[PDB]
Amino acid sequence: PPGPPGPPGKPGANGLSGERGPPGPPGPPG
Amino acid sequence: PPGPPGPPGKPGANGLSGERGPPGPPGPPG
Amino acid sequence: PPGPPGPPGKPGANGLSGERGPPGPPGPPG
Incomplete structure (x- = not known):
């Protein structure tokens, strides 16, 4: 029978x- | 025997x- | 026998x- 699976892969x-x-938008008037 | 780690996950x-x-800052003076 | 790789990892x-x-840019003149 197959051997056991390895652990999951990493992320x-x-x-x-x-x-x-x-x-940004232009500033207000001076 | 147990297998190796799985492949890495998707990005x-x-x-x-x-x-x-x-x-922006206020404009220049009047 | 050699086991399979584990599951694929998470994303x-x-x-x-x-x-x-x-x-933003400077505002208009005052």
């Missing part, structure tokens, strides 16, 4: 970082 | 984008 | 969220 690679957000 | 989910930046 | 850790976007 996959960490997900990518999110990218940076977009620039 | 993790993409991180979420940063959000919109702060408003 | 990777979730990605970390991104940096806020940069400050």
